[PDB]
């Protein structure tokens, strides 16, 4: 939380006491928070990691590999063509 939005890191440790800057960009990949019920499951209870984090991330993209039948065949063909 402190890293992402605030854009800085703060160490009061022991110690050296300083506010030092980490202004990194961030990507994250997570599972379906238990139960493959990632596709059908509710807009909430699916994410598994409330709450403010869900906001901090500018974009939340969903990846259910669910047909979308006519989409499966195409993907398979693509993979086949690739296998070369």
């Amino acid at each position: 939380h402190e890293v992402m939005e605030q854009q800085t890191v703060t160490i009061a440790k022991a110690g050296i006491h300083t506010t030092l800057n980490a202004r990194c960009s961030v990507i994250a990949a997570a599972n379906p928070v238990f139960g493959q019920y990632d596709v059908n499951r509710d807009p909430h209870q699916n994410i598994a990691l409330p709450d403010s984090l869900l906001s901090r991330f500018d974009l939340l993209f969903v990846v259910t590999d669910d047909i979308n039948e006519i989409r499966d065949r195409s993907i398979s063909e693509h993979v086949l063509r690739t296998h070369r």
Binding site: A12, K13, A14, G15, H17
Partner: protein, 272 residues
């Protein structure tokens, strides 16, 4: 005037300046009352007050002579209070039966000279000075015996003559005692027969309430002496006064060489 080395606090001057200090309220802004209380009990250890000499005149300078040079000033102060006991007795004529009560050892216990700031603030420039300190005591060390009067022996004849330590060193005459006899052979130092005096050691954290936060407090080992030894236990957060000391330590190991960085400890003449 009898100048004494570099301390330059003159004998046969300050003694009288202290001798006429007697009988004062005064001022304030006790004194002889509490001494008259002292003479019966035989408890010795005159606690004084500090501040007395300030702002009081005379001896406005004596406060500065003690503060800047406590080492001699305490000894002279003890001599003078002893002779002022001697002069207290002759006033009432025959007292306490008779002269033996004066022979008993007395000392001054000065305290609260200015308000010093911490151990931490202290300059290395002031190494003989009276220094307030405060902090809890983490441990009270077992009693170490300290040399006062040394004893010596030889294979010849054997003879019992012995010499006092004085300064922090011991030099025995090569040869020899009584007489004579001689020969050149090394002196035999009896370990147990010689006299000893109590020296404790007390560890003190520097004011855990006052800290750089979060850096852990610094140790100050104050060694005390005499009656003060074993007069305390642990964790006492109150305050202590005494003379600062830097003494060399022996390093690696053996070699008889000095680490050249002197360790620092407090003589702590008084505790309150």
């Amino acid at each position: 005037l009898r100048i004494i080395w570099g301390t330059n606090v003159s004998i046969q001057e300050c003694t009288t300046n202290f001798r006429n200090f007697l009988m004062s309220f005064k001022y304030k802004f006790y004194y002889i009352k509490q001494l008259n209380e002292m003479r019966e009990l035989g408890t010795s250890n005159l606690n004084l007050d500090a501040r007395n000499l300030l702002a009081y005149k005379q001896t406005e300078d004596l406060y500065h002579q003690l503060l800047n040079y406590p080492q001699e000033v305490i000894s002279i102060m003890d001599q003078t209070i002893k002779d002022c006991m001697v002069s207290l007795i002759v006033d009432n004529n025959l007292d306490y039966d008779l002269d033996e009560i004066e022979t008993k050892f007395y000392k001054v216990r000065p305290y609260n000279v200015g308000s010093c700031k911490g151990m931490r603030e202290l300059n290395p420039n002031d190494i003989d000075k009276l220094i307030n300190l405060k902090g809890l005591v983490l441990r009270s060390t077992p009693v170490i015996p300290d040399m006062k009067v040394a004893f010596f022996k030889c294979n010849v004849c054997d003879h019992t003559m012995a010499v006092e330590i004085d300064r922090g060193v011991i030099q025995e005459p090569a040869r020899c005692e009584r007489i004579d006899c001689n020969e050149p052979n090394s002196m035999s130092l009896i370990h147990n027969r010689c006299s000893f005096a109590d020296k404790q050691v007390i560890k003190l954290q520097e004011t855990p309430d006052f800290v750089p936060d979060g850096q852990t407090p610094h140790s100050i080992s104050l060694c005390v002496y005499d009656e003060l030894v074993d007069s305390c236990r642990a964790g006492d957060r109150i305050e202590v006064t005494g003379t600062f000391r830097s003494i060399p330590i022996r390093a690696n190991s053996r070699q008889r060489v000095l680490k050249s960085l002197y360790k620092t400890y407090v003589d702590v003449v008084h505790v309150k």
